[PDB]
């Protein structure tokens, strides 16, 4: 269960529409806080506990303080459905570069 490659598209696919609805601005926080909790010793074990994505899917969006719009809840479940919801930072680093590319042309 280590599809690190899934974070590359996640950071972009989640950014593609985040730009059309002008979410990118407030959306940056959601990914920043999400990527920060996934790389947290206690949260890391909680996420990689079993094959069931539900235990880590709702647990993640909840520990964030329910501050995630519809896409924040849809992404964490799909990310967990692929057995790699803990790869939030794997997408964050990719997303930060997408902003630089959008903030350049």
């Amino acid at each position: 269960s280590e599809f690190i490659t899934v974070a590359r598209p996640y950071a972009k696919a989640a950014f593609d529409f985040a730009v059309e609805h002008q979410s990118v601005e407030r959306w940056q926080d959601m990914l920043a806080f999400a990527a920060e909790v996934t790389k947290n010793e206690q949260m890391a074990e909680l996420l990689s506990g079993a094959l069931a994505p539900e235990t880590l899917a709702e647990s993640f969006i909840a520990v964030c303080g329910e501050q995630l719009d519809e896409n924040g809840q849809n992404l964490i479940r799909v990310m967990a459905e692929n057995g790699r919801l803990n790869a939030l930072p794997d997408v964050l680093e990719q997303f930060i570069h997408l902003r630089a590319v959008s903030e350049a042309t």
Binding site: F3, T5, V6, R8, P9, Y10, K12, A13, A14, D16, F17, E70, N71, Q73, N74, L75, R77, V78, N82
Partner: peptide, 22 residues
Amino acid sequence: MQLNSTEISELIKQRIAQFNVV
């Protein structure tokens, strides 16, 4: 290339913004 996790981007774009809307 479209076949490995890197191509799921379009599938993600449809689910990340429209997961519970099918």
